[PDB]
């Protein structure tokens, strides 16, 4: 239901990133508060159904598109939000992880060991950046309950680079 | 009141960006939903007091820290959110603006002419990136009611590079 209305709001751009790469732009969703609320409601409903008796401590969002809906979802759930950023952006002591090359970081003091988290991002394509975020979560000695994405490019089979379960809305 | 509790949650990092540059990290605010809600409430209260009879059409947030609270504030206000991104990130036709060098873009079809908007970001330092966002808003033929920031580094006098009024929470 919501997923369908959200799918319709997406705009496709052929060869945008680069030749061959078809891009799925979810930005129009945020331009409309009604559509944005539906996106948040859809993820919240999924997490309540998937983890009925497991408390989620933090939503961990990937820079920068994961930042567009991650914090809002965290607030809707009454939980904290922590970002995974491109290296060099976060101040203080950080754990690092590499996607063979792109480097990512997370602040060491952001999440206590034993915390249960959900990693979110807009699109899972190759899955490389999400995989790196998983490693960062592992270093914090936290538990990765699931990855939640808005869209998934099946032909790239990015889900195969990820250990924890994956849920994709559209 | 809220501002005080928010100020206390900030973490300072000397010479982080680079030598001399003192960094103000607001990320701890997002780790606590109660603090995050207060940040959103504070901006909402400000905008309701400053623009009681002027409808805000969009919150325009700067990449990437402006993405952390901008969308959530937009939803709290019942308005749309549109991002200003580092060049090369947005798909489709974009307006461009340069901060003499860093280039920024905004999608041409994101905001209708005549719209009233608020530009938001976490920190205003030199004001260069915010100034560029202002130019993008001008090209969309939209009205810039105000810039809203979480923090301001007064010694850099970034506010002097900005035309529209500025409100800084802390």
Swiss-Prot record, chains A, B:
It comes from Saccharomyces cerevisiae (strain ATCC 204508 / S288c). It holds the Pfam family Pribosyltran. GO terms for molecular function: adenine binding; adenine phosphoribosyltransferase activity; AMP binding; metal ion binding. The keyword Magnesium applies. It is found in: Cytoplasm; Nucleus. Its main location: cytoplasm. Signal peptide: none annotated. The modification Phosphoserine is found at residue 64. Catalyzes a salvage reaction resulting in the formation of AMP, that is energically less costly than de novo synthesis. AMP binds at residues 125-129. It catalyses: AMP + diphosphate = 5-phospho-alpha-D-ribose 1-diphosphate + adenine. Pathway: Purine metabolism; AMP biosynthesis via salvage pathway; AMP from adenine: step 1/1. Present with 11200 molecules/cell in log phase SD medium. Its EC number is 2.4.2.7. One of its GO terms (biological process) is adenine salvage. It is an enzyme of class 2 (transferase). Gene3D superfamilies: 3.40.50.2020. InterPro entries: Ade_phspho_trans, PRibTrfase_dom, PRTase-like, UPRTase/APRTase. Its cofactor is Mg(2+). The keyword Iron does not apply. Belongs to the purine/pyrimidine phosphoribosyltransferase family. Changing residue 65 to A: 4-fold decrease in activity. This is Adenine phosphoribosyltransferase 1. Keywords: Cytoplasm, Glycosyltransferase, Magnesium, Metal-binding, Nucleus, Phosphoprotein, Purine salvage, Transferase. SUPFAM superfamilies: PRTase-like.
